[PDB]
Amino acid sequence: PISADFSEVENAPSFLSLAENTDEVLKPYTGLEIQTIITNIVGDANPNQSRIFDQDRLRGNQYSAGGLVTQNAVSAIPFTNLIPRTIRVGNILVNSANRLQITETNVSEYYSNPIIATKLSEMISDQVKNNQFSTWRRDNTSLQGFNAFDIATINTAILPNGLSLESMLLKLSLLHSIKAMNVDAASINRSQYQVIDHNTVPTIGAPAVVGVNNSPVFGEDCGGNNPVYPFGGGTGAIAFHVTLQTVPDERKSYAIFVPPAILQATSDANEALALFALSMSEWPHALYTVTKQTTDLAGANAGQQVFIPTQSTIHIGGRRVLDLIIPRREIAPNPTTLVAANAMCMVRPQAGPDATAGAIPLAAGQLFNMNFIGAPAFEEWPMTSYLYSWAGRFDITTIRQYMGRLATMVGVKDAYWAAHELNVALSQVAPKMTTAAGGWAAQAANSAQQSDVCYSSLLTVTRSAANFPLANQPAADMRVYDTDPATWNKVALGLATAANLVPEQSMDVPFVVGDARASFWERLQAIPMCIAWTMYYHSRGITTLAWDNAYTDNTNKWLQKMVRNTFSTTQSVGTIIPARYGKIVCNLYKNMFHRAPAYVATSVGGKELHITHFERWLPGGTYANVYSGAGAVVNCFSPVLIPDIWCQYFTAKLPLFAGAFPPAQGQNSTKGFNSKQGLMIHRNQNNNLVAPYLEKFADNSSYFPVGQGPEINDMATWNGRLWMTTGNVQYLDYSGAAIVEAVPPAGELPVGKQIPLLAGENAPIELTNAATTCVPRYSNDGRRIFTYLTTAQSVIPVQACNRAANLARSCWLLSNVYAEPAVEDAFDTLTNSSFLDVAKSVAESAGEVPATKALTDLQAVDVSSLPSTSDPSNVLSQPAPLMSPPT
Amino acid sequence: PISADFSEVENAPSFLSLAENTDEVLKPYTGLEIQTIITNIVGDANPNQSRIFDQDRLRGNQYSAGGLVTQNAVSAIPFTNLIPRTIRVGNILVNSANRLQITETNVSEYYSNPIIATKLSEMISDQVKNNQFSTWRRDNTSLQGFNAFDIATINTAILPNGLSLESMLLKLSLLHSIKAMNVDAASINRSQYQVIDHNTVPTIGAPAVVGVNNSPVFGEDCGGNNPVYPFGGGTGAIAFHVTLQTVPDERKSYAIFVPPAILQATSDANEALALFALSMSEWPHALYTVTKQTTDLAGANAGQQVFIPTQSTIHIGGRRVLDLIIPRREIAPNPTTLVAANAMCMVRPQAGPDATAGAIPLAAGQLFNMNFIGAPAFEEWPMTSYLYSWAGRFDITTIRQYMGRLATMVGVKDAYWAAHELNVALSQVAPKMTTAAGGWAAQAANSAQQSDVCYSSLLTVTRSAANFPLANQPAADMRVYDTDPATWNKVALGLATAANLVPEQSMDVPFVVGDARASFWERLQAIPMCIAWTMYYHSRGITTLAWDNAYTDNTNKWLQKMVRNTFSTTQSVGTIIPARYGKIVCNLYKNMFHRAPAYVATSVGGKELHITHFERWLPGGTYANVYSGAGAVVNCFSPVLIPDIWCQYFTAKLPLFAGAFPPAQGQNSTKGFNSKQGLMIHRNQNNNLVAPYLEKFADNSSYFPVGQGPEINDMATWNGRLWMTTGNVQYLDYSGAAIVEAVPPAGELPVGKQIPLLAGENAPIELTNAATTCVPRYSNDGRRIFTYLTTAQSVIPVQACNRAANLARSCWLLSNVYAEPALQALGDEVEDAFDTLTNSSFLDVAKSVAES
Amino acid sequence: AYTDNTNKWLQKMVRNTFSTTQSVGTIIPARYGKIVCNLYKNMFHRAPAYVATSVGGKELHITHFERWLPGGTYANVYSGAGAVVNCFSPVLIPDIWCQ
Amino acid sequence: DNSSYFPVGQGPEINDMATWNGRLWMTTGNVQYLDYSGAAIVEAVPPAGE
Amino acid sequence: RKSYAIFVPPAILQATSDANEALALFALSMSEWPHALYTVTKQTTDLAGANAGQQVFIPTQSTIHIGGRRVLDLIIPRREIAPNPTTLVAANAMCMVRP
């Protein structure tokens, strides 16, 4: 919140107060929290009616330090998911000179909620045991038309991990994020196309066209009409089956049953099959492309401009070949001939409306010839082309309906919301800041600096070094959970369940799915993530070069622990453990925004720990820096990516060191802190250098002692900002010597990105659009960093710390409002009771059927011999169930 | 755990504390949680790859004694089951010159858990008493499909013994592990293909192909199409029957009944049948071969390459011939013609898909001609060829079906986990270490030394001496229980039950079986087993020559009792009595890992006891040693296979003498122990010889008294490691004269095996991959062994024991261990604010782990 | 509504008029279908046939009103000369029949 | 708040009498189906009066 | 195919005067539908009555698709107390009524 008087900044909460862990439960951050402030919309409304094409800026009056008032000043939204692939130069569209951004994931099995066999599987085992008294081969009922021997094999040897569903739901949310772009322009912000290319102006008159494998440069059309994997460079295989017996022996252990709860629609069922095939294979299967009509700043030149979505570049390794087992239409003997097999399909697979070339060409609408016993030749298709043909037909409303049918088998609300959080964390991206004196700056068009970019975590994104397909693989950026086919098979049929797998009474998905407003919201959810990470890095004074080398440094020992505990590299009792200091950022988010991040569970010996997206990053990336006006790098600062008005205008509570400078009000303007706060001024041998009041330990260190670093003090950081915010500071040593790190040209600070204005807008003035809170303190070689003024330049600021004088600073002219976290149809009121009881019954539906053990017992030869009597089912202990105990 | 500081090694537990009995029940230590220690690992240069093909290795940053940092250095996983039969030399595959490894086993009988009669049997014998079974008709049969006269005559047997299922399930699991190699190349880590042949690179493009009797050299083919058993040669015999009346005399006592439950176990009843037959006959029947495409280290010379699985060579059982009684689907009198017998059966037995030659050739899919009461001739098939036919069709998913069916019929949980333990203990295998001053070393290509290998038990494995079929004098390794046919038949037909015969759900079958990761998990389970043995052979200083001769040729009484008590002995009935000191090794396992080994029932005279794989080895073996470069045998050391980092980084707790050195250049860097604790130095300055602070002598200063050996003292062993880790140690006696044992070339210590690097990886530096903990103290002659330095070389280390100096050694920068600056400008002790913010949430984890 | 519209209300609307599957694969009856049944019984004072159904071991009924599948196409009308017109809500029969 | 566009997540309410008045306007000879501004709707319409 | 066999009770066979007709009716009742396309032919004439002729219609019931059981086995009652047949003539004589 913005301070109105110095009394408000002086009474702001300390940083340690906000990093305490909190116990209360909290609602999710939906992004409407920002929408109420930066837009007209007050209640639910048609996105097309609202023209949210023009709702993409912070706006407001600004006050200058000289006493003039600027009206209709603006600041751009920092994030976007679009990477320009053609760029404007000299008012003419031209191709990109820079290689594309890429992301890599770590994917592994981990323990989840403990799992248990259902009543129905106890039924199946009873059927086998009662059969054993006979000469007859029919062991058990064949569930949902699948072969009874297959139910017999699926119902055996369960894993103790539990099941996750995370990678699946990620692939589905990445694709939803990509197709969301395809709606009309009135519902997408202009700013999203010009976060990187600030010289282009998108036209409102046509919707953007999403396509596949089209890019002009660097071999980014991964085969074109003859598709191959963007990373592997190969091609997959996909084969369909009625029974497991036809699956080749080399890969019968990898097969996946396709549940018939999906495919229940009158239409779009073959499409549902293609989509389910997409959610369990490797991603990306192709490079998607957004194409939008755009024009020059004058609106003269016009053309189709090419963009690559970030979601289409992030790699999630999975299976390349796969085998799906289609539901049977009626219980029957397995087919021995082709016609018997084709006639027997519930949904018969076919190619989508888009022809492909190469070996095994696919015609649009082409049907598959089912595999069967005694078949002369095994049949299969390349998978990259099968996913290619349907790729242009997927859209948001169908993914919503699919996901809604999926909802009725298993819980998918929280899991999807978590995978969506991960989507937003890996996809929204901002360009690096430029230093300046004034309010705006940008790098040269079609330059390496223009396109260099960063995560909400202040880490730079790696680039490709060669033409697609990529011969080699980048270090992983983040670790996600995998979904095992075996336990998937057990759960899809009702043989097993766990607390995270329970169907939910809503029978419905998160609000973000199926909306045309989704891109705007995802763009707005990245903001809090950066606010929390920047508070994390700016609470301490380490410079970007020192982070950049911290992991291996042996100059200091504390810097190493500091780097090492910010990432996830610990495990215990077979499962993943969250980064030890990511919990601090998680704590900060809750205390500052009064909301709760989405989390998954991990079981450690049976105890549940929560893991948010903050705790799962991996070491190896480079930290964000800022460039000079000429494009030279600047190392001296703490990492930064966004201007601090975003931090301080969208919080309920903020640490004291980061607050805004208060408005002029008659005599009183700005104020500092002195020896009455326990601070002290630093002087050296040189009489023409002065540094502010600082912590008392600062007098007795020029190098930090090994095993120790700079402390949290909010007031000293405050005076550090007051010194920097004068236009003439020196970033120096205890003795007044130059530090090893590169420093900006004098008096400059990093500032936010420039975008073209609308009529009536003004550019931001002075330091009203700049990071300020990045006060350096820890040099790479272990020296302290000081901010010096000359004596004459020193007098007014020191008296201002003494509160005898006043400093003059610019501010936004804005008030504080932070909203509370917060529909029945007539038909819903008509049916509310029946919905209330049926929803309650579905929660226990599990593998349940009305028949009890007491009925089935009457049908048995011997009740005592039944495995259900001698082994009643229990939840599995972790990591392993007891085996061969000492009697 | 590795040590970040010397306070961590002062506070480590004593060996005696860890050898102490613990009473609580503990969980099994599966490879599914051992897996995560290799993945999820500190280090920033690491490209954290997902494929299990690449998660094959121990990666990490390292720190030199000179203060330099090394990124992403590598240590290989020591074990494998594959044995190369083609060897690359000169960048090309070349036929191997070395003979195949072999394993052998002895049977025992199982009096534990004697059976209890069902009500059914008791009423049948009751009817035999009140009648003469005269009520029954010629054609009466049960629903199962056997006639009543047979069940009645089987009922009449009285058995002392319980039922075991062990040898059965063991054969099933060995075959499982062989078939588990057939999955795609991404699913098996490549390090497994190059533990022996380290000049070879497996290709990720194609799956390994599993065949049989295709070996290049040494008669390995086993006669090809006509299959003869690899041990002893000759064919077996197999026959099928609807009644036991038709089985020939002198074989009637040995017949097995096949329950319909075996036949309905899988979609193809013939496959389930052959699987049962293989399960209850002698193993191996043939030699399976794994073929994998490989390429040159430069990638220049690709080709197919042959490997022989270790499971394929273990020898178990002896039942060359058998008779199977099969259910009749109709209620009929016993057959008199051939066609009646054919029509009569529940499913007629058939040959498998792959045809074979011989005096009795079998066409593919050929149908057996059933036996009947008229006997123009008895009819029969060769058994090795009958199994050669079905050998290709066995598959891990179907085995998962089969195990589920067995679990329903009788509980398979406990028994299968124990059998799996024996499978790991017998098949997993590591090469003997070579000595070096530096980080990496290996023996010459296609050398005999390249192929010497050992168990997790640190016993060297036997090698074949002649071409197959073998006619060897047997050299067995361990005892196993056998499954008895009559006790089988009493249970298959409802005539008896036991306490361990409780039926189970199919869901409870252990998750390893039928899973494609299992091979990988196998290797992992070998690592903790060794650690335990390693801590047993190191706490005492006995050298490898002394272990080679204690049982066969040494006049010292103490070694004799020592080698004698480490192994098991027979009872008057012939039952096992478990190894006395083996109980110590079990204890170690449970204190270092907080996990338990499988337990198996045993009896002495009618007294319950248990047995683990730790207590069932046979006395009379040869021990692990190491090779100098150029391959000369050296045997001064106590036996060793694996590097210290493996022992140190997987344990929850280790004894004090085995802790890792702290990083160089810190306050509280490596140190030693002195008089105040209780030690005393030996000096010999008249000859330039100084030795560390050691244990006070007890009339055993130069020769040990007959009937006594060196005492357990953790701190002297530690000081001996300090003297050793210095560059030029010298192993001499009390006078400073040469010991009888062969010694390493000066300065050398045994070190881990070399493997080819991935790009971006580094070879380990210094003694970071060395084994250090094996310090000699007791020689074959009975004299003490001393580690000496010269009077000048010995001056700093004495000051470090005396704690007035620090020493410098290399380390791994893992798991909370950080680098030390050369200055050390200490400040006031200061808890960091982030550590106080996160203290509780951190302790919660430890508590959750403590629960488990 | 079921295949291509970004309005949430039509989506829930077309969704609730039809039946959905249970984890076992059993029918869960259409939620708004119960309204249509009610209409039938108030306009005619006669009942449609009822059939037993279960959710987890809980009794329920089903009529032909609640067992249609989502994803269909609807009734429209033709101009003379046969051009499609679709401004109206769907219709087949004249008011006198309803009345 | 649904005078020209319905809010996302809401639709027209059940009101019998307005539907009645709409039938009255329709049963007159030349009804015209347009929007709030009096502009053409996207749906195809009957030839006038039909 | 042993797992899928249906037993035909004698009650189906004594259902009608011709047991084969009742048998075929049971078989049609438990196999896949339709097996064939029935056709209704009716004489018709012109609106002036000028042009009479036969005219073909296809019933809507004939085109609905239900079931999937292409193949089946029927177990039939034995009218005599006998052991299972070994020859053809024994099996023919044995049955309650031969199909």
PDB file of N, CA, C and O in Angstrom, chain A residues 107 132 135-137 139 156-157 254 473 479 552 564 571-572 580-581 870-871 878 884, chain B residues 27 40 49-50 71 143-144 184 264 266 400 405 414 503 505-506 816-817 835 838 849:
ATOM      1  N   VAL A 107      11.348 -35.117 -14.352  1.00  0.00           N
ATOM      2  CA  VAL A 107      10.113 -35.880 -14.195  1.00  0.00           C
ATOM      3  C   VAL A 107      10.357 -37.216 -13.509  1.00  0.00           C
ATOM      4  O   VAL A 107      11.042 -38.076 -14.042  1.00  0.00           O
ATOM      5  N   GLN A 132     -11.593 -71.634  -7.898  1.00  0.00           N
ATOM      6  CA  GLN A 132     -10.561 -72.673  -7.829  1.00  0.00           C
ATOM      7  C   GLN A 132     -11.054 -74.077  -7.450  1.00  0.00           C
ATOM      8  O   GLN A 132     -10.308 -75.044  -7.574  1.00  0.00           O
ATOM      9  N   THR A 135     -13.526 -76.846 -12.596  1.00  0.00           N
ATOM     10  CA  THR A 135     -12.738 -77.273 -13.744  1.00  0.00           C
ATOM     11  C   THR A 135     -12.935 -76.235 -14.849  1.00  0.00           C
ATOM     12  O   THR A 135     -12.519 -76.411 -15.989  1.00  0.00           O
ATOM     13  N   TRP A 136     -13.558 -75.125 -14.479  1.00  0.00           N
ATOM     14  CA  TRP A 136     -14.044 -74.142 -15.446  1.00  0.00           C
ATOM     15  C   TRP A 136     -13.213 -72.855 -15.469  1.00  0.00           C
ATOM     16  O   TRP A 136     -12.871 -72.302 -14.430  1.00  0.00           O
ATOM     17  N   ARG A 137     -12.880 -72.411 -16.677  1.00  0.00           N
ATOM     18  CA  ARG A 137     -11.911 -71.339 -16.902  1.00  0.00           C
ATOM     19  C   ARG A 137     -12.402 -69.918 -16.639  1.00  0.00           C
ATOM     20  O   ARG A 137     -11.592 -69.003 -16.601  1.00  0.00           O
ATOM     21  N   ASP A 139     -12.826 -67.330 -14.463  1.00  0.00           N
ATOM     22  CA  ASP A 139     -12.419 -66.896 -13.120  1.00  0.00           C
ATOM     23  C   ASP A 139     -13.195 -65.746 -12.458  1.00  0.00           C
ATOM     24  O   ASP A 139     -13.487 -65.811 -11.265  1.00  0.00           O
ATOM     25  N   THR A 156      -3.560 -56.776  -9.718  1.00  0.00           N
ATOM     26  CA  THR A 156      -2.477 -57.499  -9.053  1.00  0.00           C
ATOM     27  C   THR A 156      -1.232 -56.628  -8.835  1.00  0.00           C
ATOM     28  O   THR A 156      -0.897 -55.813  -9.687  1.00  0.00           O
ATOM     29  N   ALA A 157      -0.560 -56.814  -7.696  1.00  0.00           N
ATOM     30  CA  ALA A 157       0.748 -56.199  -7.387  1.00  0.00           C
ATOM     31  C   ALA A 157       0.787 -54.673  -7.407  1.00  0.00           C
ATOM     32  O   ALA A 157       1.549 -54.082  -8.164  1.00  0.00           O
ATOM     33  N   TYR A 254       3.711 -51.429 -20.492  1.00  0.00           N
ATOM     34  CA  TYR A 254       3.539 -49.988 -20.605  1.00  0.00           C
ATOM     35  C   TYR A 254       2.145 -49.550 -21.058  1.00  0.00           C
ATOM     36  O   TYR A 254       1.900 -48.362 -21.229  1.00  0.00           O
ATOM     37  N   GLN A 473      20.336 -31.639 -24.966  1.00  0.00           N
ATOM     38  CA  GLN A 473      19.351 -31.276 -23.958  1.00  0.00           C
ATOM     39  C   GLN A 473      19.910 -30.332 -22.889  1.00  0.00           C
ATOM     40  O   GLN A 473      21.011 -30.540 -22.384  1.00  0.00           O
ATOM     41  N   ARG A 479      11.318 -29.516 -11.263  1.00  0.00           N
ATOM     42  CA  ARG A 479      10.919 -30.916 -11.170  1.00  0.00           C
ATOM     43  C   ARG A 479       9.428 -31.134 -10.894  1.00  0.00           C
ATOM     44  O   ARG A 479       8.872 -30.558  -9.975  1.00  0.00           O
ATOM     45  N   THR A 552      29.575 -22.263  -5.968  1.00  0.00           N
ATOM     46  CA  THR A 552      30.866 -22.938  -5.955  1.00  0.00           C
ATOM     47  C   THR A 552      31.922 -22.094  -5.236  1.00  0.00           C
ATOM     48  O   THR A 552      33.024 -22.552  -4.962  1.00  0.00           O
ATOM     49  N   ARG A 564      22.467 -22.855  -1.708  1.00  0.00           N
ATOM     50  CA  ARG A 564      22.144 -24.264  -1.697  1.00  0.00           C
ATOM     51  C   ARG A 564      20.753 -24.539  -1.122  1.00  0.00           C
ATOM     52  O   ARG A 564      20.079 -25.452  -1.581  1.00  0.00           O
ATOM     53  N   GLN A 571      16.148 -35.275  -0.477  1.00  0.00           N
ATOM     54  CA  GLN A 571      15.089 -36.269  -0.420  1.00  0.00           C
ATOM     55  C   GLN A 571      15.133 -37.001   0.910  1.00  0.00           C
ATOM     56  O   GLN A 571      16.128 -36.955   1.617  1.00  0.00           O
ATOM     57  N   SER A 572      14.044 -37.679   1.246  1.00  0.00           N
ATOM     58  CA  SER A 572      14.028 -38.546   2.416  1.00  0.00           C
ATOM     59  C   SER A 572      12.985 -39.631   2.299  1.00  0.00           C
ATOM     60  O   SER A 572      11.888 -39.400   1.802  1.00  0.00           O
ATOM     61  N   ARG A 580      14.494 -25.566   1.491  1.00  0.00           N
ATOM     62  CA  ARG A 580      14.343 -25.127   2.865  1.00  0.00           C
ATOM     63  C   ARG A 580      13.975 -23.655   2.983  1.00  0.00           C
ATOM     64  O   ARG A 580      13.218 -23.283   3.874  1.00  0.00           O
ATOM     65  N   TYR A 581      14.488 -22.817   2.087  1.00  0.00           N
ATOM     66  CA  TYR A 581      14.158 -21.397   2.150  1.00  0.00           C
ATOM     67  C   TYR A 581      13.018 -20.970   1.245  1.00  0.00           C
ATOM     68  O   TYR A 581      12.652 -19.801   1.254  1.00  0.00           O
ATOM     69  N   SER A 870      -9.743 -63.674   5.255  1.00  0.00           N
ATOM     70  CA  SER A 870      -8.410 -63.831   5.819  1.00  0.00           C
ATOM     71  C   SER A 870      -7.478 -62.646   5.532  1.00  0.00           C
ATOM     72  O   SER A 870      -6.484 -62.460   6.229  1.00  0.00           O
ATOM     73  N   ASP A 871      -7.800 -61.854   4.513  1.00  0.00           N
ATOM     74  CA  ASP A 871      -7.126 -60.581   4.255  1.00  0.00           C
ATOM     75  C   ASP A 871      -8.084 -59.437   4.024  1.00  0.00           C
ATOM     76  O   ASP A 871      -8.243 -59.000   2.886  1.00  0.00           O
ATOM     77  N   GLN A 878       4.083 -46.892   4.212  1.00  0.00           N
ATOM     78  CA  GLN A 878       5.097 -46.306   3.347  1.00  0.00           C
ATOM     79  C   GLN A 878       6.447 -46.142   4.040  1.00  0.00           C
ATOM     80  O   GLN A 878       6.494 -45.916   5.242  1.00  0.00           O
ATOM     81  N   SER A 884       7.889 -60.507   5.398  1.00  0.00           N
ATOM     82  CA  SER A 884       8.597 -61.501   6.202  1.00  0.00           C
ATOM     83  C   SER A 884       9.048 -61.000   7.575  1.00  0.00           C
ATOM     84  O   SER A 884      10.225 -61.087   7.902  1.00  0.00           O
TER      85      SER A 884
ATOM     86  N   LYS B  27      10.812 -52.427   8.607  1.00  0.00           N
ATOM     87  CA  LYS B  27      10.381 -52.519   7.217  1.00  0.00           C
ATOM     88  C   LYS B  27      11.470 -52.968   6.250  1.00  0.00           C
ATOM     89  O   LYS B  27      12.640 -52.723   6.485  1.00  0.00           O
ATOM     90  N   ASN B  40      17.920 -36.682  -7.181  1.00  0.00           N
ATOM     91  CA  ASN B  40      17.778 -35.717  -6.088  1.00  0.00           C
ATOM     92  C   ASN B  40      19.063 -35.542  -5.289  1.00  0.00           C
ATOM     93  O   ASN B  40      19.195 -36.038  -4.178  1.00  0.00           O
ATOM     94  N   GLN B  49      18.829 -35.200 -15.693  1.00  0.00           N
ATOM     95  CA  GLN B  49      18.128 -35.974 -16.717  1.00  0.00           C
ATOM     96  C   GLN B  49      17.066 -36.897 -16.141  1.00  0.00           C
ATOM     97  O   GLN B  49      17.240 -37.448 -15.063  1.00  0.00           O
ATOM     98  N   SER B  50      15.963 -37.059 -16.866  1.00  0.00           N
ATOM     99  CA  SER B  50      14.844 -37.866 -16.389  1.00  0.00           C
ATOM    100  C   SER B  50      14.966 -39.358 -16.670  1.00  0.00           C
ATOM    101  O   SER B  50      14.558 -40.167 -15.850  1.00  0.00           O
ATOM    102  N   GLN B  71      34.061 -29.714 -10.556  1.00  0.00           N
ATOM    103  CA  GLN B  71      32.639 -29.911 -10.776  1.00  0.00           C
ATOM    104  C   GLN B  71      32.243 -31.185 -11.504  1.00  0.00           C
ATOM    105  O   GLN B  71      32.852 -31.582 -12.494  1.00  0.00           O
ATOM    106  N   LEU B 143     -15.226 -82.217  -8.119  1.00  0.00           N
ATOM    107  CA  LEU B 143     -15.356 -81.105  -9.062  1.00  0.00           C
ATOM    108  C   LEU B 143     -14.025 -80.659  -9.644  1.00  0.00           C
ATOM    109  O   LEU B 143     -13.976 -80.136 -10.746  1.00  0.00           O
ATOM    110  N   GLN B 144     -12.955 -80.884  -8.892  1.00  0.00           N
ATOM    111  CA  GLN B 144     -11.599 -80.567  -9.315  1.00  0.00           C
ATOM    112  C   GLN B 144     -11.219 -81.303 -10.590  1.00  0.00           C
ATOM    113  O   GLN B 144     -10.501 -80.774 -11.433  1.00  0.00           O
ATOM    114  N   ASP B 184      12.492 -51.827 -23.347  1.00  0.00           N
ATOM    115  CA  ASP B 184      13.225 -50.867 -24.176  1.00  0.00           C
ATOM    116  C   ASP B 184      14.453 -50.255 -23.490  1.00  0.00           C
ATOM    117  O   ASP B 184      14.505 -50.133 -22.271  1.00  0.00           O
ATOM    118  N   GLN B 264      -5.922 -72.490 -15.014  1.00  0.00           N
ATOM    119  CA  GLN B 264      -6.788 -71.355 -15.274  1.00  0.00           C
ATOM    120  C   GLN B 264      -6.064 -70.071 -14.872  1.00  0.00           C
ATOM    121  O   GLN B 264      -6.645 -68.994 -14.815  1.00  0.00           O
ATOM    122  N   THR B 266      -3.693 -68.481 -16.510  1.00  0.00           N
ATOM    123  CA  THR B 266      -3.404 -67.564 -17.604  1.00  0.00           C
ATOM    124  C   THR B 266      -4.213 -67.913 -18.842  1.00  0.00           C
ATOM    125  O   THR B 266      -4.802 -68.983 -18.917  1.00  0.00           O
ATOM    126  N   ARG B 400       3.229 -62.137 -13.666  1.00  0.00           N
ATOM    127  CA  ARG B 400       2.448 -61.386 -12.698  1.00  0.00           C
ATOM    128  C   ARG B 400       1.047 -61.998 -12.521  1.00  0.00           C
ATOM    129  O   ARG B 400       0.568 -62.154 -11.384  1.00  0.00           O
ATOM    130  N   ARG B 405      -2.409 -65.683  -9.089  1.00  0.00           N
ATOM    131  CA  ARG B 405      -3.187 -66.898  -8.891  1.00  0.00           C
ATOM    132  C   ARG B 405      -2.646 -67.690  -7.713  1.00  0.00           C
ATOM    133  O   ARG B 405      -3.412 -68.171  -6.869  1.00  0.00           O
ATOM    134  N   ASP B 414       5.471 -63.342   1.799  1.00  0.00           N
ATOM    135  CA  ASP B 414       6.678 -63.526   2.579  1.00  0.00           C
ATOM    136  C   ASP B 414       7.702 -64.388   1.866  1.00  0.00           C
ATOM    137  O   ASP B 414       8.897 -64.055   1.793  1.00  0.00           O
ATOM    138  N   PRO B 503      -4.328 -68.150   2.519  1.00  0.00           N
ATOM    139  CA  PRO B 503      -4.619 -67.499   1.235  1.00  0.00           C
ATOM    140  C   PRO B 503      -4.681 -65.968   1.296  1.00  0.00           C
ATOM    141  O   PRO B 503      -5.142 -65.395   2.277  1.00  0.00           O
ATOM    142  N   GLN B 505      -4.968 -61.965  -1.035  1.00  0.00           N
ATOM    143  CA  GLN B 505      -5.468 -61.238  -2.197  1.00  0.00           C
ATOM    144  C   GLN B 505      -4.397 -61.098  -3.265  1.00  0.00           C
ATOM    145  O   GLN B 505      -3.212 -61.066  -2.969  1.00  0.00           O
ATOM    146  N   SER B 506      -4.830 -61.043  -4.514  1.00  0.00           N
ATOM    147  CA  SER B 506      -3.927 -60.881  -5.638  1.00  0.00           C
ATOM    148  C   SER B 506      -3.239 -59.531  -5.573  1.00  0.00           C
ATOM    149  O   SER B 506      -2.163 -59.340  -6.119  1.00  0.00           O
ATOM    150  N   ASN B 816      25.223 -30.704   2.704  1.00  0.00           N
ATOM    151  CA  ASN B 816      25.542 -29.777   3.788  1.00  0.00           C
ATOM    152  C   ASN B 816      27.033 -29.550   4.041  1.00  0.00           C
ATOM    153  O   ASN B 816      27.405 -28.867   4.996  1.00  0.00           O
ATOM    154  N   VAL B 817      27.879 -30.111   3.189  1.00  0.00           N
ATOM    155  CA  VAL B 817      29.318 -29.908   3.310  1.00  0.00           C
ATOM    156  C   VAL B 817      29.750 -28.788   2.372  1.00  0.00           C
ATOM    157  O   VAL B 817      29.463 -28.824   1.176  1.00  0.00           O
ATOM    158  N   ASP B 835      17.787 -19.327   9.126  1.00  0.00           N
ATOM    159  CA  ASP B 835      17.756 -20.590   9.859  1.00  0.00           C
ATOM    160  C   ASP B 835      16.821 -20.579  11.065  1.00  0.00           C
ATOM    161  O   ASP B 835      16.374 -21.628  11.499  1.00  0.00           O
ATOM    162  N   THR B 838      13.183 -20.850   9.700  1.00  0.00           N
ATOM    163  CA  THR B 838      12.825 -22.127   9.115  1.00  0.00           C
ATOM    164  C   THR B 838      13.156 -23.313  10.012  1.00  0.00           C
ATOM    165  O   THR B 838      13.101 -24.454   9.582  1.00  0.00           O
ATOM    166  N   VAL B 849      10.694 -38.476   9.779  1.00  0.00           N
ATOM    167  CA  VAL B 849      11.618 -39.542   9.414  1.00  0.00           C
ATOM    168  C   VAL B 849      11.860 -40.476  10.594  1.00  0.00           C
ATOM    169  O   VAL B 849      11.993 -41.687  10.429  1.00  0.00           O
TER     170      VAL B 849
END
